[PDB]
């Protein structure tokens, strides 16, 4: 009858030590297990490296076509610390376009390429790690600290499924030109073809434009994945997966589960009037009320027509002056009579005080 419509879906068991599934637009956590346990991120570290780089290029600090000259510290076979790790095989003296180095970072997980771009972007690796951890602070991540540009095992570096899912959200949102690289399945440098090890890119059942893989014998098998269905986008991060086949199978389970049982809705957009309230002492009698940021809600799929919204005002009356985006109350979104999310009710257009004097006196005073 209606137990169907109010059904909570069982969450599938996940053969991973830590995971999280979130909606990209709404931020809603659909499923989680040990999402805040600090773990080693392995090459998921390179998501942040890519984020810092994308911010730099966004700010015009360098271009795709600028040629980086490879220094001694990015010499692949000149630094045995790189042994047994993925590399794009850079040698001192080469001039490699920025567009190729970031593809070594994102697609081949090339640790030498991270060193190349770090010195280029920030002058040194320490400076670049400083940018990384500063963006950790700027994004409000609470279980993430970086000590390398590549994600080779550093004793004091860690992250979490939630923080890595939030880093992936930040990538898609803040630096989309950089994020659009992760869907490329193959990249060739210096006559060596290497594959993007995110096998979900190959899965036709999903529209995975994918993020980053990572694996060390201490981290396990890590993968941050993102897919779309229509205009809904989900993000999954599993850490401590058992095998390469295991981490992708589990991630895919979360993404199809999330898509099948939940949907994302956009019930109100910025600048569209949600409500109207009288105003006192103003040049306008009424205030137009809405949101300063588009509302995205994640609800059970099919239940959109059952979504109801209402609002409360912080004060009994509204007195001018009122500014653009001044918060005067709360919008309540309810499903089945229960409030499922709130977002601030704000003034859509500033409303100054009365001032009804001769327009010319006004000018004259200025003049
Ligand atoms: C990041 O976690 C490390 C790097 N990244 C990956 C990955 O993209 O999944 C692994 S996979 C790579 C595939 N073949 C293995 C190998 O023996 N070599 C040397 C290429 C590893 C890899 C560990 C990064 C820190 O190195």
From TrEMBL:
One of its GO terms (biological process) is peptidoglycan biosynthetic process. Substrate binds at residue 212. Pathway: Cell wall biogenesis; peptidoglycan biosynthesis; Glycan biosynthesis. GO terms for molecular function: penicillin binding; protein homodimerization activity; serine-type D-Ala-D-Ala carboxypeptidase activity. Keywords: Carboxypeptidase, Cell inner membrane, Cell membrane, Cell shape, Cell wall biogenesis/degradation, Hydrolase, Membrane, Peptidoglycan synthesis, Protease, Signal. The active site is at 43 (acyl-ester intermediate), 46 (proton acceptor), 109. It is an enzyme of class 3 (hydrolase). Its EC number is 3.4.16.4. The keyword Cell wall biogenesis/degradation applies. It is found in: Cell inner membrane. GO terms for cellular component: outer membrane-bounded periplasmic space; plasma membrane. It is a peripheral membrane protein. Its main location: membrane. Pfam families: PBP5_C, Peptidase_S11. Residues 262-353 form the Peptidase S11 D-Ala-D-Ala carboxypeptidase A C-terminal domain. It catalyses: Preferential cleavage: (Ac)2-L-Lys-D-Ala-|-D-Ala. Also transpeptidation of peptidyl-alanyl moieties that are N-acyl substituents of D-alanine. Belongs to the peptidase S11 family. Removes C-terminal D-alanyl residues from sugar-peptide cell wall precursors. This is serine-type D-Ala-D-Ala carboxypeptidase. It comes from Escherichia coli. The gene is dacA.
């Amino acid at each position: 009858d209606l137990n169907i419509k109010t059904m909570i879906p069982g969450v599938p068991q996940i053969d991973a030590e830590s995971y999280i599934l979130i909606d990209y637009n709404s931020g809603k956590v659909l499923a989680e297990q040990n999402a805040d346990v600090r773990r080693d991120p392995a090459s998921l570290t390179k998501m942040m490296t890519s984020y810092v780089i994308g911010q730099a290029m966004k700010a015009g600090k360098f271009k795709e076509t600028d040629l980086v000259t490879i220094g001694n510290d990015a010499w692949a076979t000149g630094n045995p610390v790189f042994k047994g790790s993925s590399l794009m095989f850079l040698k001192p003296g080469m001039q490699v376009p920025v567009s190729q180095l970031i593809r070594g970072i994102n697609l081949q997980s090339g640790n030498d390429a991270c060193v190349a771009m770090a010195d280029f972007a920030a002058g040194s690796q320490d400076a670049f790690v400083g940018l990384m951890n500063s963006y950790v602070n700027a994004l409000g991540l609470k279980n993430t600290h970086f000590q390398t540009v590549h994600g080779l095992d550093a004793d004091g570096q860690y992250s979490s499924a939630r923080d890595m899912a939030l880093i992936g959200q930040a990538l898609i949102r803040d630096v989309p030109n950089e994020y659009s690289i992760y869907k490329e399945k193959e990249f060739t440098f210096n006559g060596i073809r290497q594959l993007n090890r995110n096998g979900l890119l190959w899965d036709n059942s999903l529209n995975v434009d994918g993020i980053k893989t990572g694996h060390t014998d201490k981290a396990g098998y890590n993968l941050v994945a993102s897919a779309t269905e229509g205009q809904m986008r989900l993000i999954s991060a599993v850490m401590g997966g058992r095998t390469f086949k295991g981490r992708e199978a589990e991630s895919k389970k979360l993404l199809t589960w999330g898509f099948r049982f939940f949907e994302t809705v956009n019930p109100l957009k910025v600048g569209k009037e949600f409500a109207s309230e009288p105003v006192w002492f103003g040049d306008s009698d009424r205030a137009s009320l809405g949101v300063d940021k588009d509302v995205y809600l994640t609800i059970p799929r099919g239940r959109m027509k059952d979504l109801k919204a209402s609002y409360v005002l912080n004060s009994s009356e509204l007195h001018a002056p009122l500014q653009k985006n001044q918060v005067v109350g709360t919008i309540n979104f309810q499903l089945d009579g229960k409030t499922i999310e709130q977002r601030p009710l704000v003034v859509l257009q500033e409303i100054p005080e009365g001032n009804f004097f001769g327009k010319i006196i006004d000018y004259i005073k200025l003049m």
